[PDB]
Amino acid sequence: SHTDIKVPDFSDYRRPEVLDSTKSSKESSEARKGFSYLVTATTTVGVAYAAKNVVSQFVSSMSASADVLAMSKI
Amino acid sequence: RQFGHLTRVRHVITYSLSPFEQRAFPHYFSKGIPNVLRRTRACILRVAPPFVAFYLVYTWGTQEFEKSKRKNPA
Amino acid sequence: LMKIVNNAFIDLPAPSNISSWWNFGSLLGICLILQILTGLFLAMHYTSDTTTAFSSVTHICRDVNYGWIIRYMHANGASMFFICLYMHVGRGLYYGSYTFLETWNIGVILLLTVMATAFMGYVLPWGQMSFWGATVITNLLSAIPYIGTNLVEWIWGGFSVDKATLTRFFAFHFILPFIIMAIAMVHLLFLHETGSNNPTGISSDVDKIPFHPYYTIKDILGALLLILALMLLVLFAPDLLGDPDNYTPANPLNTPPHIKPEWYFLFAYAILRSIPNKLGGVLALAFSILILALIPLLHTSKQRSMMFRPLSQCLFWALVADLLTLTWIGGQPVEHPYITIGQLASVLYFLLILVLMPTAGTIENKLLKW
Amino acid sequence: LMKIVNNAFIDLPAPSNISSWWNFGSLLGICLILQILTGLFLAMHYTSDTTTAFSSVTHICRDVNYGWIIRYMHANGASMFFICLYMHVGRGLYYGSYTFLETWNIGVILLLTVMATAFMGYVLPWGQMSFWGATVITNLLSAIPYIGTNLVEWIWGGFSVDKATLTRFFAFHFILPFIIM
Amino acid sequence: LVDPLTTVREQCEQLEKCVKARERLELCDERVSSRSQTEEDCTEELLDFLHARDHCVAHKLFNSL
Amino acid sequence: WLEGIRKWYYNAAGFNKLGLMRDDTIHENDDVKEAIRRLPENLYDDRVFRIKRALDLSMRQQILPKEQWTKYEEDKSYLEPYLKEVIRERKEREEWAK
Amino acid sequence: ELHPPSYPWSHRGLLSSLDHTSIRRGFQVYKQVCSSCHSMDYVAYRHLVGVCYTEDEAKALAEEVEVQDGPNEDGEMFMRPGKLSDYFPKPYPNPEAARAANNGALPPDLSYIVRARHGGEDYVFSLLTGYCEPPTGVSLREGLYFNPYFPGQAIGMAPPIYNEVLEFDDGTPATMSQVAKDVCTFLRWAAEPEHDHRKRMGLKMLLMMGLLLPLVYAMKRHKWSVLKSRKLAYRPP
Amino acid sequence: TLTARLYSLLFRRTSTFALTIVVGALFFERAFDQGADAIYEHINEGKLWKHIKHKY
Ligand code: HEC
Ligand code: HEM
Ligand code: HEM
Ligand code: HEM
């Protein structure tokens, strides 16, 4: 029935820091939530590095070309 | 269309876990690599032999073309 | 409240058995926007005059601050564009997208929109393959009797290619992506009433799932591979696909010994070049493309996919040999070891499609009794 | 079945006490498509170079078969365009369209899209009012302190109007109607 | 003064593929000169002597310079 | 000889490795949507769980172990009775209209 | 045809740059030799800045040559010493004069010739150093010459280069070879003034995309992990 | 651990989250260019301007 129901084991998949059912969470959760958002953040860093350079190319294309500066001061 | 009025389901159970409670890449090398090969052994025989002939027709296509520009004894 | 229509890209039902192939289904949205974005900034210094256009390209690659990249993010971007399509489209055959008749036809009109667009994009810089690349193809439309000379002269703006031919393309070429930009939404609209189509071919209504976390990032992962495979070429081998000759100025009074348009026509151009007759191959050309509209009347199997039709896989990957052959055979000249090929390869193309893929389902149904 | 969205232009509820003013509400759809249609065929012979653009206009008005009309269906079309708007917009005040806050703001962004568009459309033929018509207005953006000289030089493609100023508009000007579309 | 190239071409005419193509070139040379009327030439044997030559030169030439 | 091939080709399709049947892989048209709709719950629900898990494994590209695979002799024709019933009504629906 | 080999270079490597010292002597060649009949119109002295010469030094060459510029107030034109904005001196005013100065044949431009000819450099370096005696059974009009790398093996190319044809600044050997090195190095720069910078973004890309690609591939595998580990069952009566 | 102590300080609150990124990105920018250019110089030593920028 709905009580004979049982949950299998994910110990083949879980993190090592939680496999001991006798322990408790809240001692690694703060870390487990940190390592993954670190990937989210570190990802977000490099995308921003891409944006500053890739856009400035286009914007600096809108800028005065090299041909004009030759005629500017002289 | 959206969720709610698609179809019928009866007597089905779904178990699943947070991502945080499991490593992202467990058994990648350990279990993935055979599954790669198993995926390979089911497809190579119906994919390669065209490309096998292609490599040959790409070969003989040059050699005969290579000889034709080379002269004849006359 | 235009927030409810953008649920189709956020909260849309879609399957879960999905490969990495369907990254390609959305990269075009990234190719197209990027390509437009590139080309738009690019046309800030293009000029639509014969006497200066080729030079006006040189105005970019030399004197603009980091603009020289933009010639190649755009140009070789157009190659990565097509690399998606013939991985996007052969998909629909290997999985059975083409039953969605209201959508599959839309997937054609894009292709002829693009392959007639791109033809107007290689020609702008007056490369000495621009000119003849426009001459040969456009000359063929003289093949028709009693009107071929008219429409061709009518499009040439005279009796032959000239300045007047150029500007007429640059506007026709700067515009169609926007026409594609809206047709893109149409192509997704008829989808929206039915949704996607798994590799198995089974109606997966039971297992349709959200879209914002899962396939968004998955597509972004593909876009990364695209930008990678795009940034590689421009940085490491931009002269690879874009033929060398196109850096030559235009001159009608001299040809190269060898002619070939850009690589992607070549599966199709070879079909025509096979036929010694003039007109007898032209109708085969568009037929080779417009056969796609004609396939879905040839879904013989009451299955859908080809993951569960092993014999279809024997034919399907054999078709790729023919295309990838005609690709190479097209880009090579007219001599005896190669003419013998295209006289077969052209026939093989029409043959595999209209005889043997139908023949499969008529058999595979009989192999399993329905 | 994209036939259900085009009921908004076929089977849509709408009032019955309606004047002749609201003809103008849809003429823009006709002005815009016509104007685009005109200009598109028109740019088949425009040239984005200083040394030939003004002449390239003359290529039309003289040598093209009935193309000389197209300079004016388009150009003076743009005047009839604006004649609709300030009969389209003052309407909303005289009747009270402007309570539809989600719509009225959209009605602005068009206007600045157009009035900055059209500014790029009068300038193409190098009329001696094109140049100064672009100089004076654009010069004003130097009014800002510490950035005005930058953005203006940045848009001029140098230190003053030139060939580089032209092409940068012709693309910015050939495009926005589709953004409006 | 000297061309360093000749120093390198000289050594390579001794190697196998050059000597063999050289001998073939000589019979070609006499195949043509001996005959009176010939629409034939030793462009045939010349190029194979050279496609084999310059491959060795690739290996080491910019070591000097 | 024939019958060795139907068993053989049935193994090369692969859908016996994903716990599926012959009927489950059918293309869906209006003729079949009726038939599926006509199916009983004891069997209809048994369709979904066969399908539902094969999808989850197609996601992974995984399969089931050899024991769970489907045997040719157990490839029951549970759907054909309901199907041909329909087309017996289709062809009557049309020729009678002629 | 004839396929040139793949001669190595100081820049063939996918993070290799150009030896600017080699360029510095290469530019001497074009002015002393090739600028008599080759019309490089897509270049100016200013582009040499930051590459081989400086502002004032390269400007000394603009002072050297006269250039036709300026409508006089009389209504005529004149000659002045050029400047850094001025493109190179065109040898001849039009193509036809070049055909007239030769045996009916035209010199091509050399701005983008490298990227407009298969093999690029390796064609050119072996072209000059492919001169030899014609073979037996061949005949050529006057003005034409033999060179296997050119199509048809027949060309109106007078031999431009030879050992001790000129001298260079620092005093390196003026062999037929080293000169042939700097010149082909020079022309690649013509159709690529960005090589020094292409590799720079050529490198920045990898240590980003090589660094991101795992992370995004993890964030993928992060979210999907719910379904990479999802189990089911079937419990009707 | 460092991972956990990092979480409670910065990656917890969203308004704090974007602060770390642009800051670290700024400090990251100053390093990445210096890393690449020196290596690009390390490879092509004796070829660039700055290695002939003293003779003239
Ligand atoms: C005496 C005038 C003159 C000099 C000096 C000269 N060239 Fe040539 N060059 C010509 C002419 C004339 C042609 C025409 C070749 C033809 O018509 O096939 C030509 C052809 C060429 C080509 C065309 C090759 C191709 O694939 O089409 C190149 C490249 C070239 N020269 C480079 C050079 C180089 C390198 C040098 C110095 C080593 C040089 N030129 C010096 C007159 C000259
Ligand atoms: C599917 C859409 C398009 C295709 C297939 C296409 C095709 C091409 C190709 C292959 C080139 C290469 C020319 C070269 O490398 O020298 C090119 C150049 C060019 N494209 Fe397009 N293009 C497309 C869209 C656009 C767009 C959207 C714009 C502007 C917004 C544009 C403007 C230009 C211009 C001005 C050039 C000249 C640059 C050059 O020739 O190098 N194109 N086009
Ligand atoms: C700019 C051009 C295009 C855009 C923006 C576009 C967009 C899309 C997108 C986002 C999808 C969903 C992704 C997926 O199904 O994997 C899709 C699917 C599809 N596309 Fe494209 N597409 C384009 C070109 C084409 C072309 C040339 C064809 C030619 C046949 C085509 C045929 C299809 C079909 C049949 C589907 C259905 C997918 C399925 O059956 O599961 N599309 N398209
Ligand atoms: C709201 C949209 C637009 C406005 C306000 C506008 C404004 C103008 C105006 C007033 C002229 C008159 C120039 C003259 O009479 O000499 C003009 C010329 C021109 N328009 Fe635009 N235009 C618009 C859209 C377009 C479009 C859609 C195109 C192309 C599809 C286009 C291309 C041109 C060209 C090439 C010219 C030069 C012809 C000339 O100056 O006579 N414009 N524009």
XYZ file of N, CA and C in Angstrom, chain C residues 62-215:
462
model
N 41.816 47.329 -41.603
C 43.047 48.031 -41.291
C 42.834 49.134 -40.267
N 41.890 50.034 -40.524
C 41.852 51.315 -39.837
C 40.860 51.368 -38.691
N 39.959 50.408 -38.590
C 38.960 50.419 -37.533
C 39.513 49.734 -36.295
N 39.135 50.251 -35.137
C 39.579 49.715 -33.859
C 38.853 48.410 -33.595
N 39.562 47.300 -33.761
C 39.048 45.955 -33.532
C 37.863 45.633 -34.425
N 37.697 46.361 -35.525
C 36.636 46.039 -36.455
C 36.993 44.902 -37.378
N 38.289 44.642 -37.553
C 38.722 43.603 -38.475
C 38.156 42.249 -38.088
N 37.922 42.043 -36.797
C 37.294 40.819 -36.326
C 35.903 40.684 -36.921
N 35.214 41.807 -37.097
C 33.798 41.753 -37.420
C 33.590 41.202 -38.819
N 34.587 41.326 -39.693
C 34.464 40.740 -41.019
C 34.329 39.234 -40.942
N 34.853 38.630 -39.883
C 35.001 37.192 -39.790
C 34.028 36.557 -38.818
N 33.736 37.225 -37.697
C 32.611 36.808 -36.870
C 31.349 36.728 -37.692
N 31.212 37.625 -38.656
C 30.063 37.607 -39.537
C 30.237 36.573 -40.636
N 31.347 36.654 -41.365
C 31.513 35.837 -42.561
C 31.583 34.362 -42.211
N 32.609 33.970 -41.464
C 32.698 32.585 -41.047
C 31.584 32.218 -40.086
N 30.960 33.211 -39.452
C 29.731 32.947 -38.735
C 28.677 32.348 -39.636
N 28.610 32.827 -40.874
C 27.649 32.290 -41.820
C 27.954 30.850 -42.186
N 29.195 30.410 -42.012
C 29.490 29.002 -42.217
C 29.010 28.181 -41.034
N 29.296 28.649 -39.820
C 28.801 27.966 -38.635
C 27.288 27.947 -38.616
N 26.669 28.955 -39.221
C 25.228 28.967 -39.393
C 24.766 27.725 -40.143
N 25.305 27.523 -41.344
C 24.900 26.383 -42.155
C 25.287 25.064 -41.514
N 26.356 25.043 -40.720
C 26.722 23.803 -40.053
C 25.629 23.392 -39.085
N 24.887 24.356 -38.551
C 23.767 24.011 -37.694
C 22.649 23.377 -38.505
N 22.338 23.969 -39.661
C 21.137 23.599 -40.401
C 21.178 22.148 -40.838
N 22.203 21.782 -41.585
C 22.299 20.404 -42.026
C 22.694 19.456 -40.905
N 22.844 19.954 -39.677
C 22.708 19.143 -38.483
C 21.358 19.333 -37.816
N 20.667 20.420 -38.135
C 19.312 20.655 -37.665
C 18.271 19.923 -38.489
N 18.536 19.707 -39.770
C 17.497 19.258 -40.686
C 17.541 17.759 -40.884
N 18.727 17.218 -41.154
C 18.871 15.776 -41.242
C 18.400 15.086 -39.981
N 18.532 15.774 -38.849
C 17.850 15.426 -37.614
C 16.401 15.035 -37.851
N 15.623 15.964 -38.408
C 14.199 15.752 -38.593
C 13.879 14.514 -39.391
N 14.813 14.074 -40.224
C 14.690 12.814 -40.928
C 15.091 11.647 -40.035
N 16.202 11.792 -39.316
C 16.685 10.737 -38.435
C 15.798 10.552 -37.214
N 14.913 11.509 -36.929
C 13.983 11.422 -35.817
C 12.529 11.507 -36.220
N 12.214 12.140 -37.339
C 10.847 12.201 -37.806
C 10.133 13.460 -37.382
N 10.827 14.589 -37.479
C 10.156 15.867 -37.312
C 9.182 16.132 -38.445
N 9.435 15.558 -39.618
C 8.788 16.021 -40.834
C 7.315 15.668 -40.904
N 6.794 14.902 -39.953
C 5.359 14.669 -39.932
C 4.592 15.946 -39.625
N 5.209 16.887 -38.916
C 4.566 18.166 -38.628
C 4.579 18.983 -39.913
N 3.607 18.676 -40.769
C 3.576 19.223 -42.118
C 3.472 20.739 -42.111
N 2.747 21.299 -41.148
C 2.592 22.742 -41.097
C 3.888 23.439 -40.738
N 4.814 22.729 -40.108
C 6.093 23.285 -39.714
C 7.178 23.007 -40.728
N 7.183 21.804 -41.288
C 8.282 21.391 -42.146
C 8.381 22.273 -43.377
N 7.240 22.707 -43.900
C 7.258 23.587 -45.055
C 7.892 24.919 -44.700
N 7.630 25.403 -43.489
C 8.260 26.632 -43.028
C 9.764 26.454 -42.992
N 10.213 25.263 -42.607
C 11.631 24.973 -42.560
C 12.292 25.004 -43.916
N 11.501 24.960 -44.984
C 12.038 25.071 -46.329
C 12.198 26.528 -46.715
N 11.144 27.315 -46.496
C 11.106 28.679 -47.003
C 12.206 29.504 -46.366
N 12.594 29.156 -45.144
C 13.801 29.720 -44.571
C 15.005 29.409 -45.438
N 15.137 28.150 -45.836
C 16.362 27.707 -46.476
C 16.550 28.404 -47.810
N 15.490 28.462 -48.606
C 15.570 29.195 -49.856
C 15.667 30.688 -49.610
N 15.144 31.161 -48.481
C 15.338 32.558 -48.135
C 16.800 32.824 -47.842
N 17.448 31.885 -47.165
C 18.828 32.083 -46.760
C 19.769 31.814 -47.922
N 19.609 30.667 -48.575
C 20.538 30.302 -49.630
C 20.463 31.248 -50.815
N 19.363 31.984 -50.951
C 19.302 33.108 -51.866
C 19.761 34.395 -51.208
N 19.683 34.468 -49.884
C 20.270 35.589 -49.171
C 21.785 35.528 -49.236
N 22.361 34.454 -48.692
C 23.810 34.291 -48.622
C 24.469 34.491 -49.973
N 23.788 34.072 -51.032
C 24.262 34.324 -52.382
C 24.456 35.812 -52.633
N 23.655 36.650 -51.981
C 23.826 38.089 -52.087
C 24.838 38.636 -51.094
N 25.389 37.797 -50.225
C 26.296 38.258 -49.192
C 27.746 38.022 -49.527
N 28.010 36.978 -50.301
C 29.364 36.717 -50.750
C 29.795 37.689 -51.832
N 28.847 38.394 -52.438
C 29.129 39.143 -53.650
C 29.545 40.579 -53.379
N 29.178 41.128 -52.229
C 29.444 42.531 -51.934
C 30.891 42.976 -52.096
N 31.909 42.227 -51.674
C 33.262 42.781 -51.687
C 33.953 42.775 -53.040
N 33.340 42.236 -54.091
C 33.920 42.263 -55.435
C 35.263 41.542 -55.472
N 35.204 40.264 -55.148
C 36.373 39.466 -54.907
C 36.988 38.800 -56.111
N 36.418 38.989 -57.306
C 36.719 38.253 -58.538
C 36.104 36.855 -58.517
N 35.576 36.430 -57.366
C 34.639 35.328 -57.267
C 33.252 35.805 -56.905
N 33.145 36.994 -56.318
C 31.865 37.671 -56.213
C 31.214 37.783 -57.578
N 31.936 38.407 -58.502
C 31.420 38.698 -59.829
C 30.998 37.425 -60.538
N 31.960 36.549 -60.795
C 31.654 35.308 -61.481
C 30.774 34.409 -60.634
N 30.899 34.485 -59.310
C 29.985 33.749 -58.459
C 28.558 34.214 -58.628
N 28.379 35.472 -59.011
C 27.064 35.996 -59.322
C 26.702 35.776 -60.772
N 27.702 35.734 -61.644
C 27.438 35.558 -63.060
C 26.858 34.183 -63.326
N 27.603 33.146 -62.940
C 27.293 31.778 -63.346
C 25.904 31.397 -62.879
N 25.669 31.536 -61.577
C 24.409 31.121 -60.979
C 23.259 31.880 -61.613
N 23.381 33.200 -61.661
C 22.311 34.018 -62.194
C 22.143 33.809 -63.689
N 23.228 33.476 -64.391
C 23.143 33.235 -65.824
C 22.210 32.078 -66.133
N 22.130 31.107 -65.224
C 21.342 29.906 -65.463
C 19.884 30.226 -65.702
N 19.384 31.301 -65.100
C 17.978 31.632 -65.250
C 17.643 32.065 -66.668
N 18.651 32.249 -67.522
C 18.437 32.294 -68.956
C 18.046 30.944 -69.534
N 18.128 29.867 -68.748
C 17.787 28.547 -69.263
C 16.328 28.464 -69.677
N 15.462 29.234 -69.033
C 14.040 29.220 -69.352
C 13.877 29.749 -70.774
N 12.935 29.244 -71.575
C 12.673 29.879 -72.870
C 11.740 31.071 -72.746
N 12.050 32.108 -73.523
C 11.175 33.247 -73.790
C 11.016 34.213 -72.622
N 11.533 33.881 -71.439
C 11.560 34.835 -70.337
C 12.907 34.871 -69.628
N 13.734 33.845 -69.838
C 14.990 33.765 -69.114
C 15.891 34.949 -69.385
N 15.926 35.405 -70.633
C 16.732 36.568 -70.954
C 16.172 37.824 -70.308
N 14.867 37.861 -70.056
C 14.252 39.073 -69.537
C 14.560 39.255 -68.060
N 14.157 38.285 -67.238
C 14.338 38.392 -65.795
C 15.799 38.556 -65.415
N 16.697 37.944 -66.176
C 18.112 38.022 -65.855
C 18.646 39.411 -66.159
N 18.400 39.893 -67.375
C 18.703 41.281 -67.693
C 17.972 42.213 -66.746
N 16.764 41.828 -66.347
C 15.974 42.654 -65.451
C 16.613 42.764 -64.083
N 17.234 41.688 -63.613
C 17.883 41.712 -62.312
C 19.291 42.275 -62.400
N 19.974 42.069 -63.513
C 21.294 42.633 -63.718
C 21.272 44.148 -63.851
N 20.097 44.752 -63.972
C 20.035 46.184 -64.153
C 20.694 46.631 -65.428
N 20.519 45.872 -66.494
C 21.201 46.141 -67.736
C 21.297 44.898 -68.580
N 22.498 44.632 -69.069
C 22.789 43.429 -69.817
C 23.842 42.570 -69.153
N 24.393 43.001 -68.030
C 25.429 42.263 -67.336
C 25.652 42.941 -66.001
N 26.372 42.239 -65.135
C 26.567 42.711 -63.783
C 27.340 44.020 -63.796
N 27.021 44.876 -62.840
C 27.510 46.247 -62.812
C 27.180 46.798 -61.430
N 27.590 48.048 -61.198
C 27.211 48.787 -60.002
C 25.732 48.652 -59.690
N 24.889 48.735 -60.712
C 23.460 48.639 -60.481
C 23.074 47.276 -59.936
N 23.853 46.246 -60.237
C 23.560 44.936 -59.683
C 23.852 44.887 -58.201
N 24.829 45.654 -57.755
C 25.310 45.567 -56.393
C 24.282 46.057 -55.393
N 23.953 47.344 -55.494
C 23.080 47.995 -54.531
C 21.755 47.271 -54.420
N 21.289 46.708 -55.528
C 20.025 45.998 -55.521
C 20.092 44.757 -54.648
N 21.287 44.200 -54.453
C 21.441 43.082 -53.537
C 21.614 43.553 -52.110
N 22.395 44.613 -51.916
C 22.741 45.044 -50.570
C 21.509 45.388 -49.761
N 20.480 45.899 -50.419
C 19.223 46.136 -49.736
C 18.440 44.845 -49.596
N 18.404 44.034 -50.653
C 17.785 42.720 -50.558
C 18.495 41.824 -49.570
N 19.729 42.145 -49.207
C 20.517 41.291 -48.342
C 20.573 41.777 -46.915
N 20.390 43.061 -46.711
C 20.387 43.655 -45.392
C 19.052 43.487 -44.683
N 18.083 42.848 -45.330
C 16.680 42.958 -44.961
C 16.087 41.607 -44.593
N 16.399 40.588 -45.387
C 15.753 39.295 -45.227
C 15.937 38.660 -43.857
N 17.064 38.814 -43.166
C 17.140 38.293 -41.800
C 16.033 38.805 -40.904
N 15.641 40.062 -41.079
C 14.493 40.567 -40.348
C 13.223 39.872 -40.799
N 13.106 39.603 -42.093
C 12.001 38.781 -42.560
C 12.112 37.393 -41.969
N 13.336 36.904 -41.803
C 13.531 35.635 -41.122
C 13.234 35.789 -39.640
N 13.566 36.952 -39.076
C 13.399 37.171 -37.645
C 11.949 37.005 -37.222
N 11.009 37.373 -38.089
C 9.595 37.214 -37.792
C 9.109 35.826 -38.159
N 9.594 35.304 -39.284
C 9.243 33.953 -39.692
C 9.749 32.949 -38.676
N 10.827 33.289 -37.973
C 11.271 32.478 -36.850
C 10.147 32.290 -35.843
N 9.452 33.377 -35.508
C 8.346 33.275 -34.565
C 7.227 32.426 -35.141
N 6.964 32.576 -36.435
C 5.964 31.747 -37.089
C 6.365 30.290 -37.008
N 7.647 30.014 -37.238
C 8.129 28.645 -37.201
C 7.953 28.041 -35.821
N 7.988 28.873 -34.787
C 7.721 28.423 -33.433
C 6.244 28.433 -33.094
N 5.423 29.128 -33.874
C 4.015 29.224 -33.531
C 3.308 27.902 -33.787
N 3.363 27.419 -35.032
C 2.745 26.139 -35.358
C 3.322 25.015 -34.520
N 4.572 25.154 -34.090
C 5.098 24.262 -33.072
C 4.263 24.335 -31.807
N 3.974 25.557 -31.353
C 3.453 25.784 -30.010
C 2.144 25.052 -29.769
N 1.381 24.795 -30.827
C 0.156 24.024 -30.688
C 0.418 22.543 -30.459
N 1.643 22.071 -30.705
C 1.973 20.657 -30.589
C 3.270 20.373 -29.858
N 4.181 21.321 -29.771
C 5.425 21.084 -29.086
C 6.378 20.204 -29.872
N 7.443 19.824 -29.181
C 8.595 19.200 -29.810
C 8.322 17.725 -30.089
N 9.378 16.988 -30.438
C 9.238 15.670 -31.047
C 10.483 14.854 -30.721
N 10.382 14.005 -29.710
C 11.505 13.256 -29.160
C 12.287 12.452 -30.190
N 13.487 11.979 -29.844
C 14.200 11.065 -30.745
C 13.463 9.768 -30.989
N 12.791 9.232 -29.974
C 12.069 7.983 -30.158
C 10.922 8.140 -31.136
N 10.364 9.339 -31.231
C 9.212 9.586 -32.062
C 7.894 9.395 -31.354
N 7.923 9.002 -30.107
C 6.725 8.721 -29.340
C 6.149 10.025 -28.829
N 4.827 10.097 -28.795
C 4.146 11.230 -28.188
C 4.396 11.174 -26.694
N 5.267 12.055 -26.220
C 5.754 12.023 -24.854
C 4.979 12.949 -23.941
N 3.670 13.080 -24.166
C 2.846 14.021 -23.417
C 2.976 13.838 -21.915
N 3.190 12.601 -21.468
C 3.240 12.306 -20.046
C 4.448 12.914 -19.355
N 5.531 13.156 -20.084
C 6.828 13.491 -19.510
C 7.335 14.798 -20.086
N 6.476 15.802 -20.061
C 6.835 17.144 -20.477
C 7.152 17.969 -19.241
N 8.234 18.738 -19.313
C 8.855 19.315 -18.127
C 9.162 20.793 -18.342
N 9.602 21.523 -17.314
C 9.896 22.945 -17.503
C 11.073 23.204 -18.408
N 11.411 24.483 -18.529
C 12.340 24.942 -19.548
C 13.365 25.958 -19.070
N 13.114 26.714 -18.001
C 14.023 27.791 -17.626
C 15.347 27.295 -17.063
N 15.369 26.306 -16.172
C 16.664 25.833 -15.684
C 17.372 24.908 -16.652
N 16.599 24.031 -17.279
C 17.168 22.850 -17.910
C 17.708 23.129 -19.303
N 16.830 23.474 -20.229
C 17.243 23.584 -21.615
C 17.827 24.949 -21.923
